[PDB]
Design a protein around this ligand. Structure first.
Ligand SMILES: CCCCCCCCCCCCCCCC(=O)O
Ligand SMILES: CCCCCCCCCCCCCCCC(=O)O
Ligand SMILES: [Fe+3]
Ligand SMILES: [Fe+3]
Ligand SMILES: [Fe+3]
Ligand SMILES: [Fe+3]
Lengths: 285, 285
């Protein structure tokens, strides 16, 4: 379907638009290249580990690698729906969002290659709860936007990505990675990558907040919908946390060896503090 | 529609894939930031010009600003269709393609702002030929790919963007800009931007070639279709060149003042040499 004009021909970019200023920040803080990370110490770290120590890390990497790959694939219809609405500055920023996520895919995959598990299918650490979120709910809500770009649809997609997948699971995964492998002194390259990812992530979450708020600002029913969709997914969020927790408890070798007082009941509550504060971040007026 | 697995969980990125290697090159050669370009000399250059000298440059800027904006908006469905086919490395690269184009939009718009024409609607330098290409044929062929991602559809979209809009009009516009304002010593910031754009453009065109060839490599009927779609658009390509040419001839002030032996019958043939060599770039086997 045709264009009925071009904003930068009729006029200019809206230089004061929040998403244009988020875009400017993204060019300035998003120059990191996964190809420049040195994973060699990570290769030795992983080899030194016993088989059962090796398993300790793989479930978390598996959730991240599918997660990054899913968001790289699924964000495209959201960028397209905002394009079609003529929200040019949103689109400019989303280009950085998408390049970020592609770097995220690349980072974890280079790590898997370098530590020697590239040939290994980590699909087995995705339980049904995880599948529900990443294999189903994320692509469903995003792809919807081809045929139905209503505020209700935009709210739902922004919630699924920005406030659950990223704002809850991803952020908790950054925290879990530090609480564990930063302490044991393991996987320096991976944790460098995690740092970069966490910095990128702040812009991603801010885009989701800006999106969700601007729709709630029109009509407050949409605050209710926001919350309803958050809560509708929480059981699958926590069912995946419990699944991963029950895995670390039954594979204590890495914690024992590297003398980690690994507190799963605290990671868990961090997930809850993340989920609840994402709700807080959306003002109802 | 769901995911049936993730490549970087089952396996890894295909590190030897051409589009992964194009992606690596894009991160390394695509760090330029339009916000760092100094347009101040351009502001003085544009002010010094007489009204009729001012008009000389605006038609070319108008075609570029709509063009960049159009490709930023319209490439999204191609990235989505390749995502859905599971061509992960294509998608990784397309993220750089899209960020590039967003920088392209930004560059020309910052220039318009800085030289003082942001408030001016340059839609009047788009004739019906130009509209046919950029307002209609480009979004049509790209958007098709939501519902019809057949090789015939992918060939057509890659041809419209990579071998006409970019491979013919954009490249000739880089050449026209040097032949004119590089000679007169005008608009240093703009021409810096044009240089960067031209470097980016080489990856864009290579993606279109790789796309078109990989489909022709299956079945040779698609070489015929490639050519048929090129030629089907040429009348609108040249009708826009003639339109812009007939404008420079009737506004000789800028050429007279800055003593430019501006040869439109040579720019024109450059357009023809660009169009014909894009055809050459697609081997039929
Ligand atoms: C045992 C405590 C569990 C801690 C929670 C760990 C969750 C793993 C994270 C995987 C999901 C990654 C989603 C990426 C989102 C993005 O790229 O924006
Ligand atoms: C008088 C001689 C005419 C010379 C031809 C000039 C054509 C102007 C270019 C405008 C189209 C720009 C398309 C951008 C494509 C891209 O960003 O890949
Ligand atoms: Fe990410
Ligand atoms: Fe993210
Ligand atoms: Fe461009
Ligand atoms: Fe281009």
């Amino acid at each position: 379907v045709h264009h009925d004009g071009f904003q930068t021909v009729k006029a200019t970019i809206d230089w004061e638009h929040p998403m244009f200023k988020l875009y400017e920040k993204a060019k300035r803080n998003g120059k990191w290249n996964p190809a420049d990370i040195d994973f060699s110490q990570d290769q030795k770290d992983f080899a030194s580990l016993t088989s059962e120590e090796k398993i300790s890390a793989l479930p978390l990497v598996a959730g991240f690698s599918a997660g990054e790959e899913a968001v790289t694939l699924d964000i495209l219809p959201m960028a397209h729906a905002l394009a079609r609405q003529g929200r040019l500055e949103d689109v400019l920023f989303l280009t950085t969002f998408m390049h970020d996520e592609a770097k995220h895919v690349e980072m974890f995959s280079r790590w898997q290659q370098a530590v020697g598990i590239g040939q290994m299918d980590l699909s087995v650490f995705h339980n049904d709860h995880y599948k529900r979120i990443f294999y189903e709910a994320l692509p469903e809500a995003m792809n919807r936007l081809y045929a139905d770009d209503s505020p209700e649809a935009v709210i739902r997609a922004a919630t699924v990505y920005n406030m659950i997948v990223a704002g809850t699971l991803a952020e908790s995964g950054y925290y879990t990675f530090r609480q564990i492998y930063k302490k044991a002194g393991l996987f320096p390259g991976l944790l460098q990558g995690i740092d970069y990812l966490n910095m990128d992530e702040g812009r991603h979450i801010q885009f989701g907040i800006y999106t969700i708020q601007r729709i709630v600002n029109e009509d407050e029913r949409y605050y209710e919908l926001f919350i309803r969709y958050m809560d509708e997914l929480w059981p699958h969020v926590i069912g995946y946390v419990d699944y991963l927790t029950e895995l670390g408890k039954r594979q204590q070798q890495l914690a024992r060896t590297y003398a980690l007082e690994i507190d799963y009941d605290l990671l868990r509550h961090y997930v809850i503090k993340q989920f609840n504060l994402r709700k807080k971040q959306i003002s109802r007026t």
